[PDB]
Design a protein around this ligand. Structure first.
Ligand SMILES: COc1cc(C)c2c(Oc3cccc(C(F)(F)F)c3)c(OC)cc(N[C@@H](C)CCCN)c2n1
Ligand SMILES: COc1cc(C)c2c(Oc3cccc(C(F)(F)F)c3)c(OC)cc(N[C@@H](C)CCCN)c2n1
Lengths: 301, 301
């Protein structure tokens, strides 16, 4: 028995984190080969943030306006350019700790690990989901800007996310490592609103499977459902509609537990309609949606 | 806004994890300088586990019965000895990735990070508390035995825990890196029972403080309490009694929030007596006890 929300081991990312300072603005950068990647708003003052012209602000900056520190080592900036919303600082030294890495763009509902950093120094690691509305319920914002999100496959760090901002509602938003925002957000101090935040249905079903693998079975009923009937109920409680592809990725958990996917959907239907009646599942009083099927399979062999 | 259960960055521990095999038994070892530390029950078959004589089983083993693999590198064992419940394998090579480290013994209610490993390979990292009954609600047991728990202070890994076993109830138990068990447990396949598992009161108060720092204030009432009156209620709901020392360590969170410790105790008293009335705190429907005051202070600057 046991089911923890686990982050990926962070070591390969720790060796890439640097401090980037431009005047009184300090944040976190990612140092891969001879490039440091960071949020372009490092070149802005808190006043500049209302309606920045990033191209003109960037033109005004020279190499020597960027202080990059790796531990207690100052890196020399020899080039500065912009790719969408990320600043790229070419430095004179290739990161000798550079891992095997890719840049990927993840889908709403997918999970990743954040290496939370304070002013270029790794502070902590957590696992989260990209909400359906492309926001992140992140750690307390404390010198945290430019912290990155990543998955590990085999020997490769897949960098999927960089923190750029807090929205006025206190949720986090940011970009892929190509500097394209997730969701309709912009790196300027404008009242910006997120879409309505739905529960990630396939993740909730994956977690009910984790619960069953752990011998939690109280919420299994004798019913089944059709996808169509389930989705009528789901929509009423602000759950994403379940798709055939999502039923398909739950197949291995079905096979292992002896519980057909649509039977688990009929359990979830009743949990939504009736609540938990003051019981818990894997120690939780709420349905958890931050485990993908693949996360549950990873942890359960 | 934001409050995540964060683990320590795991990189310094990743470089110390090895596979230890004795016959058909494989588990995780910790390689620091020229010593590999692991659970002594690696020398036992599943049959040996009923009533092992570890001294006699160990005497029967030679160096070459221990297969230690670091990544895809075989380490030569040149010595085997026992310190309480941990096996120590002297190897011909000092771990060139050995961090600055200490061995500490933690107190019930203290938190640490576990680097969950599968057969010598880092799999994931999570933050947990040592329960008052000295058990760990750990990750799913999957090639996980010998995985270690640690804190980081400044540049130093404080190793506090090594997983030895699952109890029949599915909770985890283990030892300090000196091989002394936490709690009344023994590394043998005997029906072993834990003491009653109390809620870590000072951790719950620390988390209500985190909630307030994050602008969650619905559960603040106009009352105060005495320690004595609070502790009468606490004991009835299976909360550890609050001590003066515990009031003392909450002082910085009191100062920052403008909420006196005994005023937060009066909020907790009412939450225990009345429940949450279907509201949540920091997105939870249950009171969380896996953040120390020091964890909340770390994350909130
Ligand atoms: C780079 O993007 C960031 C990052 C943070 C943490 C921000 C913050 O909040 C913090 C709250 C507590 C602690 C911290 C600190 F630890 F980081 F200092 C920040 C703010 O509100 C106070 C306001 C922001 N907007 C810009 C105008 C900042 C300067 C221009 N690049 C912030 N911008
Ligand atoms: C070393 O202490 C361990 C570790 C685990 C995971 C154990 C386990 O459970 C597992 C469940 C699923 C997957 C796994 C595996 F991935 F590890 F294989 C183990 C068991 O029940 C099946 C039984 C145990 N007791 C001993 C008799 C094992 C051999 C003597 N050293 C286990 N002992």
């Amino acid at each position: 028995s046991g089911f923890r929300k686990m982050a990926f081991p962070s070591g390969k990312v720790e060796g890439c984190m640097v401090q980037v300072t431009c005047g009184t603005t300090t944040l976190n950068g990612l140092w891969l080969d001879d490039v440091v990647y960071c949020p372009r708003h490092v070149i802005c003052t808190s006043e500049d943030m209302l309606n920045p012209n990033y191209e003109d602000l960037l033109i005004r900056k020279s190499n020597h306006n960027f202080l990059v520190q790796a531990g207690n080592v100052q890196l020399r900036v020899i080039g500065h350019s912009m790719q969408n919303c990320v600043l790229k600082l070419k430095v004179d030294t290739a990161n000798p700790k550079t891992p095997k890495y890719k840049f990927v763009r993840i889908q709403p509902g997918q999970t990743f690990s954040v290496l939370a950093c304070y002013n270029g120094s790794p502070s902590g690691v957590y696992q989260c989901a990209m909400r359906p509305n492309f926001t992140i319920k992140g750690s307390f914002l404390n010198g945290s800007c430019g912290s990155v999100g990543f998955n590990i496959d085999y020997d490769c760090v897949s960098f999927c996310y960089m923190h750029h901002m807090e929205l006025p509602t206190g949720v986090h938003a940011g970009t892929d490592l190509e500097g394209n925002f997730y969701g309709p957000f912009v790196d300027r101090q404008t009242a910006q609103a997120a879409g309505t935040d739905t529960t990630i249905t396939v993740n909730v079903l994956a977690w009910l499977y984790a619960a069953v693998i752990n011998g939690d079975r109280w919420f299994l009923n004798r019913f089944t459902t059709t996808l169509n009937d389930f989705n009528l109920v789901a929509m009423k409680y602000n759950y994403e509609p379940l798709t055939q592809d999502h039923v398909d990725i739950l197949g291995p958990l079905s096979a292992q537990t002896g519980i057909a996917v649509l039977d688990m959907c009929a359990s979830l239907k009743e949990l939504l309609q009736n609540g938990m009646n003051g019981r818990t599942i894997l120690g939780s009083a709420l349905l958890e949606d931050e485990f993908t099927p693949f996360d549950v399979v990873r942890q359960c062999s």
